[PDB]
Design a protein around this ligand. Structure first.
Ligand SMILES: [Ca+2]
Ligand SMILES: [Ca+2]
Ligand SMILES: [Cl-]
Ligand SMILES: [Cl-]
Ligand SMILES: [Cl-]
Ligand SMILES: [Cl-]
Ligand SMILES: [Cl-]
Ligand SMILES: [Cl-]
Ligand SMILES: [Cl-]
Ligand SMILES: [Cl-]
Ligand SMILES: [Mg+2]
Ligand SMILES: [Mg+2]
Ligand SMILES: [Mg+2]
Ligand SMILES: [Mg+2]
Ligand SMILES: [Mg+2]
Ligand SMILES: [Mg+2]
Ligand SMILES: [Mg+2]
Ligand SMILES: [Mg+2]
Lengths: 236, 10, 236, 10
């Protein structure tokens, strides 16, 4: 690995610099290197890993959506033939997106999840597994689409089961998981009613637990609750 | 179109 | 070259798709491939080339400035020692920035400038040469800084001489050249008075020629004139 | 701090 000769602590420090610089591909490469040292990640380090890859895949998802839209219009009646280039370039971006998702899934499988025993780490990694299978599902069109969807579902469900047993309903990881699983239901699984029910239940259970929280925790939780509400508004 | 979670959670 | 097997027209078409997708590194790679076909570039194609590399180098310049600021604070009295990592990573970004600038300068030298005979193309390429030497000068600290500065100056001056002889004072290329040469004087060459004089003269000469222009040309010219004014406001 | 030209000029 290109990062094999760099100290763990140096990789972490450079990931933080890359974040400040908005160099997210570098940030991801540093954090991959840090994971590949083989030690478990701290809470802060897990967050750095997530931020890095979320930003990398987010640029790719935004690009893919623009290209897919252009390709779809090219396939309408009365659209002039322009050759293979739009499909080719959409495919290029898609393949790179798939490669990033595969990289993340590979880190989780080798060996982040298997060593994650505390709820906070295990749920966070299983949520990430669901997320990156969801990003794969957003572009999937072939024979394995059902299996990709199934993999996302399974990871999210495992995470949900742990989070309900082990975390308060206000925990930001639990909230963000439920938020993303609701988006999966709505956008991927053709289950808008399930999406809406999960968002409602999650929001209400969190509301009932806010009284237990410090001011700072309250802010963290209410931030994610607001996203649940925003989606409910969009969906109902 | 929907909002998904921020990357950083604690 | 990775683009050697792709049709010229396909590279241009994909550059335009990459622009829409905000995939500027891909856009630059497509346009490099197009230049390397060996044919001269049209006005539109020159603009695509410029947009692509301007956006790539702009992300690198923004990152470099963030890292340089962090490095400078680390060198203040009472700052704790944190090791070589900030210098190393600033150097990494700097080296990649230098490589992009070298790539652009190489395209201009092999062989865009030598085949550019019309004022519009020649001035545009000489302005680009000045710009990318200016970006090199922004990060230069060693024995060749003076020569890098000299190279920027020389390219800009050549472009200025042609543009004054061959273009109206409202031409957007002439205006953008003069704008950038003024920024060179102010930020690179330690010549604020020259910067201010050039911006003033350029603005006033353009104002006196606006009456000759269509509505659409007027809009193009006045856009660049406003940048000259904004800099004058910042500098005076 | 100063403004430089846009990339696209015509
Ligand atoms: Ca219903
Ligand atoms: Ca004076
Ligand atoms: Cl990046
Ligand atoms: Cl392609
Ligand atoms: Cl699973
Ligand atoms: Cl609504
Ligand atoms: Cl890019
Ligand atoms: Cl580095
Ligand atoms: Cl020159
Ligand atoms: Cl002022
Ligand atoms: Mg070590
Ligand atoms: Mg037709
Ligand atoms: Mg075509
Ligand atoms: Mg929060
Ligand atoms: Mg051909
Ligand atoms: Mg101290
Ligand atoms: Mg250190
Ligand atoms: Mg203009």
């Amino acid at each position: 690995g290109a990062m094999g000769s760099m100290e763990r602590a140096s990789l972490i420090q450079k990931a933080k610099l890359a974040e400040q610089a908005e160099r997210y591909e570098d940030m991801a490469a540093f954090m991959k290197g840090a994971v590949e040292k083989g030690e478990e990640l701290s809470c802060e380090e897990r967050n750095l890993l997530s931020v890095a890859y979320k930003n990398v895949v987010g640029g790719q998802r935004a690009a893919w959506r623009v290209l897919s839209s252009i390709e779809q219009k090219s396939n309408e009646e009365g659209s002039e033939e322009k050759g293979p280039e739009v499909r080719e370039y959409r495919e290029k971006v898609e393949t790179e997106l798939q490669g990033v998702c595969d990289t993340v899934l590979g880190l989780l499988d080798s060996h982040l999840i298997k060593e994650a025993g505390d709820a906070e780490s295990r749920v966070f990694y299983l949520k990430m597994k669901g997320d990156y299978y969801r990003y794969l599902a957003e572009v999937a069109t072939g024979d394995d689409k059902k299996r990709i969807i199934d993999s996302a579902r399974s990871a999210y469900q495992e995470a949900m089961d742990i989070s309900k047993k082990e975390m308060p309903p206000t925990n930001p990881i639990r909230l963000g998981l439920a938020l993303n699983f609701s988006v999966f239901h709505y956008e991927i699984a053709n289950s808008p009613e399930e999406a809406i029910s999960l968002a409602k239940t999650t929001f209400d259970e969190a509301m009932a637990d806010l009284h237990t929280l410090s001011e700072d925790s309250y802010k963290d939780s209410t931030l994610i609750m607001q996203l649940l509400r925003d989606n409910l508004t969009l969906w109902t | 179109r929907a909002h998904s979670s921020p990357a950083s959670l604690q």
